Structure formats: structure tokens, C-alpha cells
């Protein structure tokens, strides 16, 4: 039956070799490192299954590629290089991010806390990306720490937002796919079936900052029941033990985002002006208001 649209699998295997480094696996998706045979350049090949739960999902995948294509120009978003297709898969040849997931910097078992300088930088960069997406009426809707990557870890590199499979336009219906995300990263409005808002992304940015500063998930519980209660009650550990080494300004940033009412959360643009993220690079010469004149 189906005619293929994208570049042939025979061309894929001619131009690239897969490496033994599997990068991620989900129910309908596998990501594996590959190398260009001609240049030696590394990429991440994302293999997306077209058939899902009975459904022909090529239209969905095409939409995901449209979104990636629009957002390509923003350096905080992962870059799409090529697309290939075979009987069962559409394969995205994406930018390789050698640092892996920002989640690795949030793990309880990591001993080194990332410096405040670094957390500030990383949050700024994530906000720049989200600002760009929101300016183009794209809500990501799955901004879990596993979907933000780093270009390197030694030294600490730059941010790349990935995985636009849940992304929608502003004010689209909160449907069966939304209410099925990762339970601990879902916003209150998602649980309560309110429509999609840019504010949902901002809540997720609150979580990322909390996780970078405390190495603890703010809402996960005993069970998913307690997770959902924690989300809907907005029950967050701000205790002095957890926050003794976290600045007030960072606390303020998180608290202004982790609020039940999506309309009270500031926009990406306003967040970029937050006092917390205003930092002078000590290597630059500051030019004060009182001039030599």
C-alpha cells in the first residue's frame, strides 16, 4: 500500500553508519548515534515508528518535522539535518549533543551541586529557547529535564531543547495524549483539563530550576496519587534544610512559576528580566551610570 516520501533507507545506510551508542528508547521511538561516512561528523538518528496502537501516524510525524523545521533557526533548539524513511519508520537525522540530558545534573546521587553561575546560565538559555517557541505560537508541553540536552558536560556546554512530539498551538484542547505524559512533570491545568497555554511550559521551567538547585523532584510522591495531590495542591518542599544553600532570588524565581493558576505565572520574556538572572561577567569592564565626563 503506502508510498514513501522521504529519502530512501538505501541512501541512509550509504551515507551513515550507526554506532553502538544507543541514546534513548521509548514505546514508538529509538535514538541511536550515527556518523557521516564522508565527514566523520556525529549525529543522533531518531527512528520513529509510523504505526501506533493501530493508527497510521505519518501525519503526526510530518507535523513534528514541520515544527522542528520552523524552530531550526533558534540555537537553543535541536537542529534537524536530514530525514529518511523505510516501511515502518521515519528517521530524523538530528544534532548530536555530547553532554546528554540536563537530568544528569539533577540526580540525588550526583555529589557536585552545579554552581549558581551555571544554573543561572542554563536557566537563561532554556528561557531564550522557550521565548523563541512562544513567539512562534509553539507550546512544547513536555519540557521535562530528559528533553533538554547539553552540547557538553566538561566543560559545561549549551542547551538544546528536543522532542516536539507533544507540541501544540496556544489554546488547543487538553486531550488524551496530554493527560498521558510523565506524571511528576504535568502542570495543574493539564490534570484539570484546562486548555493549553504557554504557562504550562513556564511551570516546567520552575521544576527544572528546582531540580537543578535541590537534586529532588518537587512533586513526585509515595504513589501517583500523592504525585497528583502534590501537583494539584502545589505542595512543594521549601524547607530551610532543602533551601539553606539556595539563594532567595532563586527561591523567588521558582515560587513565581510553581503556582496553581497558569495566568499568574510570568511569561518567558518577563522571566528573562528576573533579578536572579541579572549577572555581570567579572571579566568585562562595567560602564557605570556616573561617566567620566
Comparing CA positions, the residue from 176, 76, 181, 58 lying closest to residue 136 is: 76
Per-residue contact string for residues 23-62; x = within reach of ligand 38O by CB under 6 A: xx------x------------x-x----------------
C-alpha cell at 188: 495543574
Interior angle at CA 102, CA 160 and CA 188, nearest 5: 90
As a whole number of angstroms, the distance between CA 200 and CA 159 comes to 20
- Grid cell 496502537 is found at 53
**169 among the known binding-site residues?**
no
When the beta carbons of 165 and 218 are compared against ligand 38O, the nearer one is: 165
**The one catalytic residue among 118, 142, 163, 201:** 142
Distances (CA, A) of 126 to 7, 53, 118, 256: 32, 33, 12, 17
Per-residue contact string for residues 67-86; x = within reach of ligand 38O by CB under 6 A: -----------x--------
Known catalytic residue at 237: no
Task: Determine, following the binding rule CB under 6 A, whether residue 90 of this chain makes contact with ligand 38O.
Answer: no
Cα 223 to its chain centre, rounded Å, is 25
- Among the residue ranges 90-98, 118-126, 188-196, 239-247, the one whose residues contact ligand 38O (CB under 6 A): 90-98
As a whole number of angstroms, the distance between CA 121 and CA 115 comes to 10
Tell me the closest approach of the beta carbon of residue 99 to ligand 38O, in angstroms: 6
Contact with ligand 38O (CB under 6 A) among 83, 93, 94, 205: 94
Contact with ligand 38O (CB under 6 A) among 12, 16, 96, 210: 96
Element of type H or E holding 18: strand 16-26
Provide the annotated active-site residues. 142
Residues of each annotated binding site for ATP: 23-31, 46
Amino acid at each position: 500500500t503506502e508510498n514513501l516520501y522521504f529519502q530512501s533507507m538505501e541512501n541512509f545506510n550509504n551515507f551513515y553508519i550507526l554506532t553502538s551508542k544507543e541514546l534513548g528508547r521509548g514505546k514508538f521511538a529509538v535514538v541511536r548515534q550515527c556518523i557521516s561516512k564522508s565527514t566523520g561528523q556525529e549525529y543522533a538518528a531518531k527512528f520513529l515508528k509510523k504505526r501506533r496502537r493501530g493508527q497510521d501516524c505519518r501525519a503526526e510525524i510530518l507535523h513534528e518535522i514541520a515544527v522542528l523545521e520552523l524552530a531550526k533557526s533558534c540555537p537553543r533548539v535541536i537542529n534537524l539535518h536530514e530525514v529518511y524513511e523505510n516501511t515502518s519508520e521515519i528517521i530524523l537525522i538530528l544534532e548530536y549533543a555530547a553532554g546528554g540530558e540536563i537530568f544528569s545534573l539533577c540526580l540525588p546521587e550526583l555529589a557536585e551541586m552545579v554552581s549558581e553561575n551555571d544554573v543561572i546560565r542554563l536557566i537563561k538559555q532554556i528561557l531564550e529557547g522557550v521565548y523563541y517557541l512562544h513567539q512562534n505560537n509553539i507550546v512544547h508541553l513536555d519540557l521535562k529535564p530528559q528533553n533538554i540536552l547539553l552540547s557538553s558536560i566538561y566543560p559545561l556546554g549549551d542547551i538544546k531543547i528536543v522532542d516536539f512530539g507533544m507540541s501544540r498551538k496556544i489554546g488547543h484542547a487538553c486531550e488524551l495524549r496530554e493527560i498521558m505524559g510523565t506524571p511528576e512533570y504535568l502542570a495543574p491545568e493539564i490534570l484539570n483539563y484546562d486548555p493549553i497555554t504557554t504557562a504550562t511550559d513556564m511551570w516546567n521551567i520552575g521544576i527544572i530550576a528546582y531540580m537543578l538547585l535541590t537534586h529532588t523532584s518537587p512533586f513526585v510522591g509515595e504513589d501517583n496519587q500523592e504525585t497528583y495531590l502534590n501537583i494539584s495542591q502545589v505542595n512543594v518542599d521549601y524547607s530551610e534544610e532543602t533551601f539553606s544553600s539556595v539563594s532567595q532570588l532563586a527561591t523567588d524565581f521558582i515560587q513565581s512559576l510553581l503556582v496553581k493558576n497558569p495566568e499568574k505565572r510570568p511569561t518567558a520574556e518577563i522571566c528573562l528580566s528576573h533579578s536572579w538572572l541579572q549577572q555581570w561577567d567579572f571579566e568585562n569592564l562595567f560602564h557605570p551610570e556616573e561617566t567620566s565626563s
